[PDB]
């Protein structure tokens, strides 16, 4: 079940392939033992390689099987393949009557031999294509006519003056750069599936029943494997060509009734289940860009399509380009609180998951904007800048460390409720998101409004606390870019009340923003504010 | 009357039924138990008050009672019962009796795989 | 078969259960409920070398399948409290009948390098034991 | 660790066990034996030397050893275990055990009890 890699695979024979298998990183996994195995019918599931040196008699030396750790994948290669070799297949760890697999199947073909009266030009969907027939001058005003066969038939739909066949509409033009010599051709834009096969091809006839074969094959593109986990994010890469680098482009998912369905557009779509998850970066010179989807659930696994037509919507004659996914949800990232809740005034503070090994990073906090196709403007780094508008009311703290850091935004007001992205330096990039949620309620410290200061005299603040807080500590401290720190003139003086500070100078040196907080040790709780000033 | 719960039937130590009676109108009821035929000593139970119910409209009451017994006596085979009186009830009683084998299942599929046939999946 | 409500790995049983709905007569359902258990033909009683013959008893009791004791949130009026979800898991003590494939079992073993006796440790699993 | 062929244990003298192991690839081993919990002399059992097995893809190599001991004993149920001592395994060590009942029984006697399947499992 965590196990995965190409459902199908396909060459011809004399040709290698290299087929990848992935699996959970834990310690148990790589060490264990790798295998490649045969399903037969009666029963077994005959090993033919295997990771502990084991190689078969029908394998020698056409294979090997190499095991990389710290990618979590495992590589098997098979050289000289044959017709006996077509079958079911199985990757795996450990005991092969246990599940612990993926089902492969493997399908190859017959070449061509001693049959070279082919002429063939290779195409993928959505670009062009020429079919050259031998122009005879000895038919000089004869029509360059080119039939359809179904069956054994050349039917009359194709003739080379302005008919044209009434499925083949509207996309069919030709260029002179003979006339005088054998130089003519049939340029296809936008190739469907229906567009395959050989056409009885000529130019100019004689009537003695004369033939010409040359065939076209069209491909469908093959999936990229990306292999994520539960409560992680994922990037696609959409590099299709510059030929359609100012059409709409789009982004969609194959479902089970032959029903692609649009997650989002460039027009200006969005499913309503990515709300406040999903990105889609401005492209660049030569036409390729980014997606972005965080916080992966389970139902997120199948096939991915993004392509480019005019209309924002999967047809037919658009280029495509694939991806296939799994989410592994035998995951080692932490659970976290999806939605957090404040009252009007209240604080939040959220915890923040990274990898332990990447612990030298620089850290980032979103906000999702949702107008455009989204966007990260950033609030706050770990190096010291802030935004303006959020100025006395936010900062980024390290502690407690070594899986987390936290964040603290304080005065809050009913607009502030969204959804909040985080995001480190690393290379590998977990996104976590949570929802703000407002409701109603009181604060729970308590204290007075925007404090004044007298000119030549002291000041004294206060602020209270109810008693489930008796057992939590207390502290206070100055705002500014870096965060803020614990000032050393506070007293805490009740037993459950009036933890206060005074300042002893009225200058303006420290005319800042304060707060009046409460952390068991490592973990910080709510906090309030409060502004002074210099009259 | 209800059963008694599966985690004290796997300690061997007393398990416990209840009794319970809702809907009706003026709050007199009696609450009695027996074991067979015999009816109990009365001080060897508990019961509760008769109290009122959140309703629509028309008002309601409402009484409980609990009974502990020994688990030899429940894996023995014989049952208990409870009685409950009041003046809106035609013949002034009605009765419950349980015991085992009351809500027992009525499909039961046992397959042995035996070896060289395993075939676990993850 | 499509809801899990218990996969144990002490005992290696796991419980399935599955609500399958007809439309006509409303009043009659049927509620499903799938059992596997796997006997390990040759295990010892406890988990050392020389304790004991192979084990030929093994019991199973529903309750002790199904418990469940990792604590949990509860929001009451505007608060989070933590709540246990069980009354019988006093802190191990669990006879455990399989391996544990994600955890590693060793042993102590005396032996003897010409003058005094150490103390040699011996893996009896031994793809999890490995130190990194 | 193998099993005392049947032949052997009619006779009621001695039987003889046998420790293999196969497929390392450097060629040094250590093998040593236990009796109950306490490690026999060296005198006792007879060790070969690693040699090179034929090949199916990789070079790797083998070794053998053997132990006598008396037919009362393997009836009384005494236990009986063989180490080896290699430079890939985890921790140096590693080891199986064989006494009378594991290991050619003639007898596979298992009782499973499943005890309240209709339970309210929570
Ligand atoms: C199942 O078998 C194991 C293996 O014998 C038992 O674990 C160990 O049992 C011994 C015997 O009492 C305990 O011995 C202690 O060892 C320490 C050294 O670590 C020594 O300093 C003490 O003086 C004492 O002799 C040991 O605590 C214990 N646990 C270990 C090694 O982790 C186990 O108790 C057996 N279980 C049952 C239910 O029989
Ligand atoms: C992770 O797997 C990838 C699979 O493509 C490995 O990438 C190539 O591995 C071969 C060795 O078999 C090298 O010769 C190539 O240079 C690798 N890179 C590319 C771009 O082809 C990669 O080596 C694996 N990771 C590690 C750390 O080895
Ligand atoms: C053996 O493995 C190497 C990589 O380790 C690979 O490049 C090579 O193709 C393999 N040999 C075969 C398939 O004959």
Same mark, same amino acid.
């Given at each position: 079940?965590?196990?995965?890699?190409?459902?199908?695979?396909?060459?011809?024979?004399?040709?290698?392939?290299?087929?990848?298998?992935?699996?959970?990183?834990?310690?148990?996994?790589?060490?264990?033992?790798?295998?490649?195995?045969?399903?037969?019918?009666?029963?077994?599931?005959?090993?033919?390689?295997?990771?502990?040196?084991?190689?078969?008699?029908? !394998?020698?030396?056409?294979?090997?099987?190499?095991?990389?750790?710290?990618?979590?994948?495992?590589?098997?290669?098979?050289?000289?393949?044959?017709?006996?070799?077509?079958?079911?297949?199985?990757?795996?760890?450990?005991?092969?009557?246990?599940?612990?697999?993926?089902?492969?199947?493997?399908?190859?073909?017959?070449?061509?031999?001693?049959?070279?009266?082919?002429?063939?030009?290779?195409?993928?969907?959505?670009?062009?294509?020429?079919?050259?027939?031998?122009?005879?001058?000895?038919?000089?005003?004869?029509?360059?006519?080119?039939?359809?066969?179904?069956?054994?038939?050349?039917?009359?739909?194709?003739?080379?003056?302005?008919?044209?066949?009434?499925? !083949?509409?509207?996309?069919?033009? @030709?260029?002179?750069?003979?006339?005088?010599?054998?130089?003519?051709?049939?340029?296809?834009?936008?190739?469907?599936?229906?567009?395959?096969?050989?056409?009885?091809?000529?130019?100019?006839?004689?009537?003695?029943?004369?033939?010409?074969?040359?065939?076209?094959?069209?491909?469908?593109?093959?999936?990229?494997?990306?292999?994520?986990?539960?409560?992680?994010?994922?990037?696609?890469?959409?590099?299709?060509?510059?030929?359609?680098?100012?059409?709409?482009?789009?982004?969609?998912?194959?479902?089970?009734?032959?029903?692609?369905?649009?997650?989002?557009?460039?027009?200006?779509?969005?499913?309503?289940?990515?709300?406040?998850?999903?990105?889609?970066?401005?492209?660049?010179?030569?036409?390729?860009?980014?997606?972005?989807?965080?916080?992966?659930?389970?139902?997120?696994?199948?096939?991915?399509?993004?392509?480019?037509?005019?209309?924002?919507?999967?047809?037919?004659?658009?280029?495509?380009?694939?991806?296939?996914?799994?989410?592994?949800?035998?995951?080692?990232?932490?659970?976290?609180?999806?939605?957090?809740?404040?009252?009007?005034?209240?604080?939040?503070?959220?915890?923040?998951?990274?990898? #332990?090994?990447?612990?030298?990073?620089?850290? !980032?906090?979103? @906000?999702?904007?949702?107008?455009?196709?989204?966007?990260?403007?950033?609030?706050?780094?770990?190096?010291?800048?802030?935004?303006?508008?959020?100025?006395?009311?936010?900062?980024? @703290?390290?502690?407690?460390?070594?899986?987390?850091?936290?964040?603290?935004?304080?005065?809050?007001?009913?607009?502030?409720?969204?959804?909040?992205?985080?995001?480190?330096?690393?290379?590998?990039?977990?996104?976590?998101?949570?929802?703000?949620?407002?409701?109603?309620?009181?604060?729970?410290?308590?204290?007075?409004?925007?404090?004044?200061?007298?000119?030549?005299?002291?000041?004294?603040?206060?602020?209270?606390?109810?008693?489930?807080?008796?057992?939590?500590?207390?502290?206070?401290?100055?705002?500014?870019?870096?965060?803020?720190?614990?000032?050393?003139?506070?007293?805490?003086?009740?037993?459950? #009340?009036?933890?206060?500070?005074?300042?002893?100078?009225?200058?303006?040196?420290?005319?800042?923003?304060?707060?009046?907080?409460?952390?068991?040790?490592?973990?910080?709780?709510?906090?309030?504010?409060?502004?002074?000033?210099?009259? | 009357?209800?059963?008694?719960?599966?985690?004290?039937?796997?300690?061997?130590?007393?398990?416990?039924?209840? $009794?319970?009676?809702?809907?009706?109108?003026?709050?007199?009821?009696?609450?009695?138990?027996?074991?067979?035929?015999?009816?109990?000593?009365?001080?060897?139970?508990?019961?509760?008050?008769?109290?009122?119910?959140?309703?629509?409209?028309?008002?309601?009451?409402?009484?409980? *009672?609990?009974?502990?017994?020994?688990?030899?006596?429940?894996?023995?085979?014989?049952?208990?019962? $409870?009685?409950?009186?009041?003046?809106?009830?035609?013949?002034?009683?009605?009765?419950?009796?349980?015991?085992?084998?009351?809500?027992?299942?009525?499909?039961?599929?046992? *397959?042995?795989?035996?070896?060289?046939?395993?075939?676990? $999946?993850? | 078969?499509?809801?899990?409500?218990?996969?144990?790995?002490?005992?290696?049983?796991?419980?399935?259960?599955?609500?399958?709905?007809?439309?006509?007569?409303?009043?009659?359902?049927?509620?499903?409920?799938?059992?596997?258990?796997?006997?390990?033909?040759?295990?010892?009683?406890?988990?050392?070398?020389?304790?004991?013959?192979?084990?030929?008893?093994?019991?199973?009791?529903?309750?002790?399948?199904?418990?469940?004791?990792?604590?949990?949130?509860?929001?009451?009026?505007?608060?989070?409290?933590?709540?246990?979800?069980?009354?019988?898991?006093? +802190?191990?003590?669990?006879?455990?009948?399989?391996?544990?494939?994600?955890?590693?079992?060793?042993?102590?073993?005396?032996?003897?390098?010409?003058? +005094?006796?150490?103390?040699?440790?011996?893996?009896?699993?031994?793809?999890?034991?490995?130190?990194?």
């Amino acid at each position: 079940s965590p196990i995965f890699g190409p459902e199908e695979v396909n060459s011809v024979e004399g040709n290698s392939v290299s087929i990848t298998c992935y699996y959970p990183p834990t310690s148990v996994n790589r060490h264990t033992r790798k295998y490649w195995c045969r399903q037969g019918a009666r029963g077994g599931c005959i090993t033919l390689i295997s990771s502990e040196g084991y190689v078969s008699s029908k !394998y020698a030396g056409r294979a090997n099987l190499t095991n990389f750790p710290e990618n979590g994948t495992f590589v098997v290669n098979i050289a000289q393949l044959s017709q006996d070799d077509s079958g079911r297949y199985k990757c795996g760890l450990g005991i092969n009557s246990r599940g612990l697999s993926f089902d492969v199947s493997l399908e190859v073909s017959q070449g061509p031999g001693l049959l070279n009266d082919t002429k063939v030009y290779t195409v993928d969907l959505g670009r062009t294509v020429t079919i050259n027939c031998p122009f005879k001058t000895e038919n000089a005003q004869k029509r360059k006519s080119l039939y359809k066969q179904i069956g054994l038939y050349p039917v009359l739909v194709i003739d080379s003056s302005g008919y044209v066949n009434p499925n !083949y509409t509207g996309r069919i033009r @030709l260029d002179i750069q003979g006339t005088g010599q054998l130089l003519f051709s049939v340029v296809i834009n936008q190739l469907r599936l229906s567009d395959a096969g050989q056409y009885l091809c000529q130019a100019g006839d004689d009537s003695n029943s004369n033939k010409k074969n040359a065939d076209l094959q069209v491909l469908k593109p093959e999936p990229e494997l990306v292999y994520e986990d539960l409560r992680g994010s994922v990037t696609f890469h959409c590099a299709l060509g510059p030929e359609v680098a100012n059409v709409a482009k789009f982004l969609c998912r194959q479902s089970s009734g032959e029903n692609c369905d649009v997650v989002v557009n460039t027009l200006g779509k969005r499913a309503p289940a990515f709300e406040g998850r999903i990105l889609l970066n401005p492209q660049d010179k030569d036409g390729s860009f980014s997606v972005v989807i965080t916080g992966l659930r389970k139902e997120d696994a199948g096939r991915y399509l993004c392509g480019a037509h005019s209309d924002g919507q999967l047809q037919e004659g658009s280029p495509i380009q694939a991806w296939q996914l799994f989410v592994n949800e035998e995951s080692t990232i932490p659970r976290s609180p999806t939605v957090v809740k404040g009252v009007a005034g209240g604080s939040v503070a959220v915890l923040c998951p990274y990898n #332990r090994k990447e612990s030298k990073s620089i850290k !980032y906090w979103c @906000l999702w904007e949702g107008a455009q196709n989204g966007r990260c403007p950033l609030l706050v780094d770990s190096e010291g800048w802030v935004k303006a508008q959020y100025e006395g009311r936010l900062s980024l @703290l390290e502690e407690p460390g070594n899986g987390t850091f936290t964040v603290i935004l304080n005065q809050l007001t009913s607009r502030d409720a969204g959804f909040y992205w985080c995001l480190t330096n690393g290379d590998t990039l977990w996104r976590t998101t949570v929802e703000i949620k407002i409701i109603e309620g009181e604060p729970n410290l308590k204290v007075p409004g925007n404090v004044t200061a007298v000119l030549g005299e002291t000041l004294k603040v206060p602020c209270h606390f109810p008693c489930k807080f008796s057992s939590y500590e207390k502290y206070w401290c100055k705002w500014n870019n870096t965060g803020c720190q614990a000032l050393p003139f506070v007293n805490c003086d009740e037993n459950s #009340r009036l933890v206060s500070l005074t300042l002893n100078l009225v200058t303006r040196a420290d005319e800042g923003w304060y707060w009046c907080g409460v952390k068991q040790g490592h973990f910080y709780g709510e906090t309030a504010a409060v502004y002074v000033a210099v009259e | 009357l209800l059963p008694p719960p599966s985690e004290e039937l796997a300690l061997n130590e007393l398990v416990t039924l209840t $009794c319970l009676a809702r809907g009706f109108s003026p709050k007199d009821v009696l609450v009695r138990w027996l074991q067979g035929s015999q009816e109990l000593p009365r001080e060897k139970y508990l019961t509760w008050a008769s109290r009122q119910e959140p309703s629509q409209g028309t008002t309601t009451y409402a009484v409980t *009672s609990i009974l502990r017994v020994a688990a030899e006596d429940w894996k023995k085979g014989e049952t208990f019962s $409870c009685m409950v009186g009041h003046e809106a009830l035609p013949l002034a009683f009605t009765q419950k009796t349980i015991d085992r084998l009351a809500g027992k299942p009525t499909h039961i599929n046992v *397959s042995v795989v035996m070896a060289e046939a395993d075939g676990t $999946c993850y | 078969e499509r809801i899990v409500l218990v996969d144990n790995k002490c005992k290696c049983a796991r419980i399935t259960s599955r609500i399958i709905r007809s439309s006509e007569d409303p009043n009659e359902d049927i509620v499903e409920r799938n059992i596997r258990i796997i006997v390990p033909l040759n295990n010892r009683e406890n988990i050392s070398d020389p304790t004991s013959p192979l084990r030929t008893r093994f019991v199973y009791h529903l309750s002790d399948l199904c418990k469940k004791c990792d604590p949990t949130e509860v929001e009451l009026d505007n608060q989070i409290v933590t709540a246990t979800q069980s009354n019988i898991c006093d +802190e191990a003590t669990e006879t455990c009948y399989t391996y544990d494939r994600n955890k590693c079992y060793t042993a102590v073993v005396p032996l003897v390098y010409g003058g +005094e006796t150490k103390m040699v440790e011996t893996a009896l699993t031994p793809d999890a034991c490995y130190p990194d």
